[PDB]
Amino acid sequence: SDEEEARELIERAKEAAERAQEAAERTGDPRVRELARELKRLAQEAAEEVKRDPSSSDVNEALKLIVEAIEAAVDALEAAERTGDPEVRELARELVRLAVEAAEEVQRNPSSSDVNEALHSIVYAIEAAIFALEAAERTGDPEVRELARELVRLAVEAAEEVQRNPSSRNVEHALMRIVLAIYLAEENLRE
């Protein structure tokens, strides 16, 4: 309602922090550990910045996006962990890395629409990647795997160009095209 929304966001941040911690411990990988620690760090810094401005309706929306980003990035990390192909894994980790960077940029400059759009695009891409990675693992299918690879590669490519030039055009249609292809491939396997 009022400050009930600020407390709700703190509680999401702390659970996101815990899930990140659990991912840091579960994995036998120093590359994942460090990403998971960075996600926990951003979760705790988001929780602390809400506590500085508890009755502030303004900046609490940029921090809502950061908490969303973290939750989705942790999901992506968990999905990467259950992914058989190291190439896809590496691509998934790179998307999470780019999400961390985009989240830091939002936190350092919460009123910039360019910086907020870049994070939004990465979160959008991560949600598409989670669907793709989860379909690859559920089906065990090589074609679904290659489509999942294509999707994450595309997402990484887009985020890195948007870093260089903020204007650089969005891959939303191109990502959804692969989602559909994955979906139909999975449906054809039911037969």
Binding site: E78, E127, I130, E134, M176, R177, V179, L180, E187
Partner: protein, 195 residues
């Protein structure tokens, strides 16, 4: 070889809350799909629709019956006068439309700008959704995907029962949906003429 999409039921929205009816069984469906010829009377704003492998929803808005591409593909719809070709086909929006069948009524697009939405399922459940952006809404509680599956093409309604969008996808992790993706009513792009 590919048959028509067949109306196998409907959902009435003009009563207090949603009410669904079955109008066709499995056998009648497959025969109707082959001929593209369906002489059943159509009523209501939401149609329950079938291909040989999937069942889903279609919603009438602005004299067009809209559904998801990922269900209907490029198929014709069975009608009293034989198979009717799509008027709109947009794979990038996951959107298709045929001219609304005789006897259907359209929903009015939302003008109120409310964020309290309601997603109508194939079984006539009504699930609250908090609008976030143009084409996304949060669920109030996490929901197993099986409660949503088969409801794409269905309406998201405002508190006044106007159409806000068409249900398209479930944002989900490990079979648990937290949010929904819908085609906004503003994206239901029509043209005055057709070649």
């Amino acid at each position: 070889k590919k048959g028509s999409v067949v109306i196998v039921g409907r959902i009435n929205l003009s009563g207090d809350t949603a009410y669904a009816q079955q109008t066709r069984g499995e056998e009648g469906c497959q025969e109707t799909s082959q001929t593209g010829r369906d002489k059943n009377q159509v009523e209501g704003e939401v149609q329950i629709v079938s291909t040989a492998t999937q069942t889903f929803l279609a919603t009438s808005i602005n004299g067009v019956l809209w559904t998801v591409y990922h269900g209907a593909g490029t198929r014709t719809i069975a009608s009293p006068k034989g198979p009717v070709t799509q008027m709109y086909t947009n794979v990038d929006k996951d959107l298709v439309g045929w001219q609304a069948p005789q006897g259907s009524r359209s929903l009015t697009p939302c003008t109120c700008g409310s964020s309290d939405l309601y997603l109508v399922t194939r079984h006539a459940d009504v699930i609250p959704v908090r609008r976030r952006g143009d084409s996304r809404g949060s669920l109030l509680s996490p929901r197993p995907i099986s409660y949503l599956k088969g409801s794409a093409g269905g309406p998201l309604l405002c508190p006044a029962g106007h159409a806000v969008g068409i249900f398209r996808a479930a944002v989900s992790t490990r079979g648990v949906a937290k949010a929904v993706d819908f085609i906004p009513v503003e994206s239901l792009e029509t043209t005055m003429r057709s070649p």
